[PDB]
Amino acid sequence: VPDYHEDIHTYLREMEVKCKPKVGYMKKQPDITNSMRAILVDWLVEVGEEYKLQNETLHLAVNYIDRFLSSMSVLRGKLQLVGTAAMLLASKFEEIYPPEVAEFVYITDDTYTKKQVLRMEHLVLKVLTFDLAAPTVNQFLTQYFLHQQPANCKVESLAMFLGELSLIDADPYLKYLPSVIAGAAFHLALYTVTGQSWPESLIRKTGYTLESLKPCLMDLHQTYLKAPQHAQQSIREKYKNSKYHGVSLLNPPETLNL
């Protein structure tokens, strides 16, 4: 029952401030780099497809990674190990039956051992202090989709699509909260399918004006336009599926009409 809708939003807004990575964490990482982090995240999208994991699992996995890499320096040789263990943790939290650990060892082409995956798991829980219930863009989108007039499945899928692309690139997107990226994506996907705009329903709900959204939105617009030319492409391939109304076909609007 939407008796909790408002409490849950407010709570999620409170909790998303506590689960915020450091923004300049990549710059303080001596061996790893934003471009390698895109490779990892893109890989994890492919892992989600292979094992038919929820989108939320993937969103949770990437939150764990950014927070991990905020306290802990990690070497390229070991960045995949952090990601694997994050997906396992995400899967344990979010899905009904997670893939066995063995499967997670497999998807790295036995580059890491099972013991190593399991003991990095336990290291991610120490650094995160078991704080796994992190709000994500996916969660905020779901809350926003209740305020659509009318329900539009193309807009939802495309909003999900855009949300995912924001995982790939820390370069702009770590500065924005999951609720703001979700607001940008909802608007961008709404604008792209119908030409409509961030509804006044969600302006009062979130307290975000279209204009407060505009920095993140412009960034998200650039990413949408450049998406075909992007080195990483696991997400476009994902949303090419009819599961998703092939929204990653739909032609991005060359202007935002701001």
Partner 1 sequence: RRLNF
Partner 2 sequence: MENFQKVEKIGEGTYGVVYKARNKLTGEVVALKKIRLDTETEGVPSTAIREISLLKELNHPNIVKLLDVIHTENKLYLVFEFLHQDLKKFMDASALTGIPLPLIKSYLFQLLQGLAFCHSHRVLHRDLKPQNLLINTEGAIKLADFGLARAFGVPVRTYTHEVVTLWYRAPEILLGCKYYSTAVDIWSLGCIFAEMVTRRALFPGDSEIDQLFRIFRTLGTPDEVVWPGVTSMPDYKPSFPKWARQDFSKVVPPLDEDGRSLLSQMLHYDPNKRISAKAALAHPFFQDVTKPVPHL
Q: Residues in the site for partner 1, rule: CB under 8 A?
A: 32-33, 36, 39-40, 43, 76, 79-80, 107-109, 111
Residue 126 binds: one of partner 1, partner 2, none (C-beta under 5 to 8 A by kind): partner 2
Q: Which CB atom, from 35 or from 222, has the smaller least distance to partner 1?
A: 35
Residue 80 binds: one of partner 2, partner 1, none (C-beta under 5 to 8 A by kind): partner 1
Q: Is 92 in the site for partner 2 (CB under 8 A)?
A: yes
Residues of this chain, 103-162, that bind partner 2 according to CB under 8 A: 114-115, 117-118, 121-122, 125-126, 129-133, 135-136, 138-139, 142-143
Report the C-alpha gap between 186 and 180 in whole angstroms: 10
Question: Whats the size of the chain, residue-wise?
Answer: 258
Q: Show the tokens assigned to 202.
A: 């969600």
Q: Show the tokens assigned to 205.
A: 């709900």
Q: Which of 91, 87, 122, 125 is nearest to 108 (CA)?
A: 87
Out of 88, 159, 162, 174, which residue is the one contacting partner 2 (CB under 8 A)? 88
DSSP single-letter state for residue 146? T
Q: Which CB atom, from 38 or from 141, has the smaller least distance to partner 1?
A: 38
Q: What angle do CA 243, 65, 221 make, to 5 degrees?
A: 55
Q: Which of 43, 61, 64, 153 is nearest to 108 (CA)?
A: 43
Report the C-alpha gap between 41 and 60 in whole angstroms: 11
Min dist. Cβ of residue 27 to partner 2 (A): 29
Q: Which of 114, 35, 115, 22 is nearest to 72 (CA)?
A: 22
> Residue 2 is which amino acid?
P
Report the C-alpha gap between 98 and 83 in whole angstroms: 15
Q: Is 93 in the site for partner 2 (CB under 8 A)?
A: yes
Report the C-alpha gap between 242 and 220 in whole angstroms: 23
Report the C-alpha gap between 103 and 88 in whole angstroms: 10
Residues of this chain, 170-199, that bind partner 2 according to CB under 8 A: none
Q: Which CB atom, from 75 or from 133, has the smaller least distance to partner 1?
A: 75
Contact 199, 177 (CB under 8 A): no
Residues 45-74 as x/- pattern, contact with partner 2 by CB under 8 A:
---------x-x------------------
Residue 111 binds: one of partner 1, partner 2, none (C-beta under 5 to 8 A by kind): partner 1
Residue 40 binds: one of partner 1, partner 2, none (C-beta under 5 to 8 A by kind): partner 1
Q: Is 23 in the site for partner 2 (CB under 8 A)?
A: no
Interacting residues with partner 2 (CB under 8 A): 1, 3-4, 7-8, 11-12, 15, 54, 56, 88-89, 92-93, 96, 98, 100-101, 114-115, 117-118, 121-122, 125-126, 129-133, 135-136, 138-139, 142-143
